[PDB]
Structure 1
Amino acid sequence: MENFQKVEKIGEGTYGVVYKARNKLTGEVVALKKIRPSTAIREISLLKELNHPNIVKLLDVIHTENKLYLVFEFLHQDLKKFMDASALTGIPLPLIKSYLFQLLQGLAFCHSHRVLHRDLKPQNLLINTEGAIKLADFGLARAFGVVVTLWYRAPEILLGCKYYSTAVDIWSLGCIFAEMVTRRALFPGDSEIDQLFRIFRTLGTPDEVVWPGVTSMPDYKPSFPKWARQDFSKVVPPLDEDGRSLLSQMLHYDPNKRISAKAALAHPFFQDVTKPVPHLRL
């Protein structure tokens, strides 16, 4: 187009097609996302001012010929592909730990700036050859808002709560952490109810004891089956107790009891964190 050269279609994003493109003027390659409101323009534009090592930079918001494009710094590979590529032997624990640590740093930053992601998934976690991992698309959900993956959706969202909190991002990261460790999605639901019951079958059907206010949620039904909680040691076996304790805190039903990114960074699991180099096949 006028100021870009579409190198390739890197895929279908939440709001539209995403292409690997090259800016004709600078020659820089970026991830150009076509969006499929004047308030959205204002909000999104504010996001350009979010700089952190673990957040994919939003270089530009382009509103021309009545189309909306978001220009992002280009990263080497997404975690989804990396996990698939590492499925035979699994991502080494030190690297899993480094990634979780960095992602929490990115979340702690966004959240301290009152920005939520709401749709964290391996597809929007990007890595580079130097061992960094970054979160892409923070704050787009709020600015915009509505086959979609439900695997990383927090239970409060599934139960129809209309007010999101920073806790939904911790839940999603918890699901991703488990998946890196076991090499299998933690809650692979095929529908909203299947997603919810898969969570219930593992963590136990929530009640007013563990989640005060749950029985009054919009889509909660007294007729939900009552499953008992499974022992955590069976959920992510290869993980040591520090990792399991941290994961359990990231998967608390009550958003208010769920650990914050900031507090998670101080968890004992990270006492020996390092920054390994991943073996990336580009």
Structure 2
Amino acid sequence: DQQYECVAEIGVGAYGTVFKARDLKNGGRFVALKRVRVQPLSTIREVAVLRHLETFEHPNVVRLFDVCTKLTLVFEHVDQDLRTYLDKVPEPGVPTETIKDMMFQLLRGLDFLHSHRVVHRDLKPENILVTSSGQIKLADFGLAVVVTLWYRAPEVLLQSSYATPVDLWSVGCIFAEMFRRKPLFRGSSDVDQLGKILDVIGLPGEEDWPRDVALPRQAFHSKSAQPIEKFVTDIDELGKDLLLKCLTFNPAKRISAYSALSHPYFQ
């Protein structure tokens, strides 16, 4: 494509590469140019879902400017991710109302995706973008040290389920991280990540542990659920309630993005 000039590599990329490029036909604005290889109905369907979502132009998801044919996806460029934002915020950290605003915007973007049956499945500060105006935009969904591990829901770690609640667990981890400015659960393997989660939330009821999984409840020896204020010190009463509703072991009992939008923490 001689309409885009690649200036820097944003990353890779299970089946392609993403570049920061100059959009030569639209005033030379920056775009995130993703080139995806093909070896396919599964892939065609996924890009149709992406194009359909773009018709709504939701304020909390990145704009998809163009799709070209081996597949070129052109998105609006955002200068920073939430990881970079949190790394640069000076002491004593992110202001209370800014944490509230960013979390509300994040849940609005996720509620949009979940209402159109799209599950992000890889929600982390690296793919939550922060615009120059302070707007939160979700990115890197709908296709296909491992930072991903730290935001994985117990049901993904156990290999039991992958429904919309998976993203609400990641929201909970990110919410706690907005205050801490360090990951809540920093594990080095699937089993270890689950162990570190249960050391904080405690062992769930025996009936809440999923059936037909390799890791039984008996493999974890967490004595008690610790108070979340020990790990998230500046969090208020309402924020604590919303956080624990996100960090609920059983995905059926976990708060949805829709209900989280109505939580008294945002009133």
- Whether 2:113 is the aligned partner of 1:114: answer no
**Percent identical residues:** 50
Whole-angstrom CA distance in 2 between matches of 1:87 and 1:9: 28
CA positional deviation for 1:41: 1.9
Give me the TM-score of the superposition, normalised by structure 2: 0.90
Give me the TM-score of the superposition, normalised by structure 1: 0.86
CA positional deviation for 1:59: 2.3
- Whether 2:258 is the aligned partner of 1:266: answer no
- Whether 2:46 is the aligned partner of 1:40: answer no
1:111-190 to 2 correspondence within 5 Å?
A: 111-140=114-143, 144=144, 147-149=145-147, 150-161=149-160, 163-190=161-188
Aligned residue number for residue 279 of structure 1: none
Aligned residue number for residue 53 of structure 1: 59
Aligned residue number for residue 74 of structure 2: 71
CA positional deviation for 1:54: 0.3
Aligned residue number for residue 23 of structure 2: 23
Instruction: Indicate if the aligned counterparts of 1:79 and 1:127 stay in contact, CA closer than 8 A.
Output: yes
- Whether 2:245 is the aligned partner of 1:249: answer yes
One-letter code aligned to 1:6: C
Instruction: Indicate if the aligned counterparts of 1:159 and 1:217 stay in contact, CA closer than 8 A.
Output: no
Which sits farther off after the overlay, 84-93 or 170-179?
84-93
Instruction: Indicate if the aligned counterparts of 1:87 and 1:183 stay in contact, CA closer than 8 A.
Output: no
Whole-angstrom CA distance in 1 between matches of 2:170 and 2:153: 7
Whole-angstrom CA distance in 2 between matches of 1:80 and 1:204: 28
Aligned residue number for residue 276 of structure 1: none
Q: Which runs of 5+ in 1 are unaligned?
A: 272-282
Aligned residue number for residue 192 of structure 1: 190
Q: What is the aligned-residue RMSD (CA, Å)?
A: 1.8
Instruction: Indicate if the aligned counterparts of 1:48 and 1:59 stay in contact, CA closer than 8 A.
Output: no
- Whether 2:93 is the aligned partner of 1:90: answer yes
Structure 1 counterpart SS, 2:188? coil
Whole-angstrom CA distance in 1 between matches of 2:34 and 2:61: 16
Instruction: Indicate if the aligned counterparts of 1:204 and 1:226 stay in contact, CA closer than 8 A.
Output: no
Aligned residues: 259
CA positional deviation for 1:105: 0.6
Structure 2 counterpart SS, 1:137? coil
CA positional deviation for 1:231: 1.5
Q: 1:220 aligns with which of 205, 215, 219?
A: 215
Structure with bigger RCO (C-alpha 8 Å, 6+ apart): 1
Aligned residue number for residue 6 of structure 1: 6
Instruction: Give the 3 Å change call, closer, same or farther, for CA 137–107 of structure 1 in structure 2.
Output: same
Structure 1 counterpart SS, 2:107? helix
Deviation string 1:26-57 (CA, Å, 9 cap, x unpaired) is 23321112335332123222212212000112
CA positional deviation for 1:193: 1.2
Aligned residue number for residue 277 of structure 1: none
Instruction: Indicate if the aligned counterparts of 1:48 and 1:60 stay in contact, CA closer than 8 A.
Output: no
Whole-angstrom CA distance in 2 between matches of 1:117 and 1:192: 19
One-letter code aligned to 2:196: R
Q: Which runs of 5+ in 2 are unaligned?
A: none
One-letter code aligned to 1:24: L
Deviation string 1:156-215 (CA, Å, 9 cap, x unpaired) is 000011x42110111101100100111110011111111111101111123325x2xx25
